[PDB]
């Protein structure tokens with residue numbers, strides 16, 4: 484059966500597309516405002532050297548902090564999110580921020596050279612730039628794999644914005660109080676996505692592939708948390724981060 488999208492489901496999709504267009508600048512025009520990227524000579528991928536310099540960390544921490552602000556704005560526009568308590572809104576935002584950043588970065592990700600290309604060569608991020616921010620291959624290589632797997636799903640922007648909304652409104656996040664209300668909001672979004680795929684997505688399992696990405700994101704989130712903890716032990720690291728980043732990942 485291929486039921487048509489209800490008027491409500493159509494409205495949810497319109498709101499989410501509008502929220503994404505207002506919070507995701509595909510020209511990356513604010514990037515000149517971040518602390519500049521610095522690429523030290525590290526052809527050897529030396530952990531000692533990367534931690535000593537953390538040359539890409541101020542730029543990527545500013546990029547991520549800016550992105551977290553955009554994700555907060557997006558989340559606030561998800562139909563039903565404002566019905567949650569302020570406490571549950573913050574729990575969901577803090578636990579999903581890194582996953583939504585990984586999802587939304589797929590728009591700048593390119594399979595041409597396996598990089599996140601945000602305009603000119605200065606704002607092109609490769610595996611080597613992430614190692615220069617203090618992260619290791621145990622996070623970066625599965626993250627690149629995830630990006631390619633997501634790129635190959637060829638999501639319609641409707642499916643992309645619904646996936647990010649479903650990711651944020653997850654009832655199984657530690658510390659959530661009203662799990663039943665969060666689950667009702669998520670089911671409303673999941674049914675919208677399932678209905679959209681069934682009547683708008685041409686041929687040639689897409690919903691199950693999208694739900695598998697959400698599970699992959701949990702593993703990536705856990706690895707990022709372990710790595711962030713290591714990064715945080717580096718003396719003077721806090722100055723290379725931002726107050727928002729420190730709070731979200733602390």
Ligand SMILES: C=C1/C(=C\C=C2/CCC[C@]3(C)[C@@H]([C@H](C)CCCC(C)(C)O)CC[C@@H]23)C[C@@H](O)[C@@H](OCCCO)[C@@H]1O
Nearest residue numbers: 506507508547550553584585587588591599608613711
């Ligand atoms: C962020 C965005 C972009 C890329 C994301 C990347 C590439 C560099 C390395 C990142 C930032 C990974 C790092 C492992 C995270 C490390 C973080 C610390 C704190 C250092 O532990 C996770 C996501 C990866 C660019 C652009 O798509 C932004 O979208 C355009 C902007 C519209 O708002 C988006 O949001």
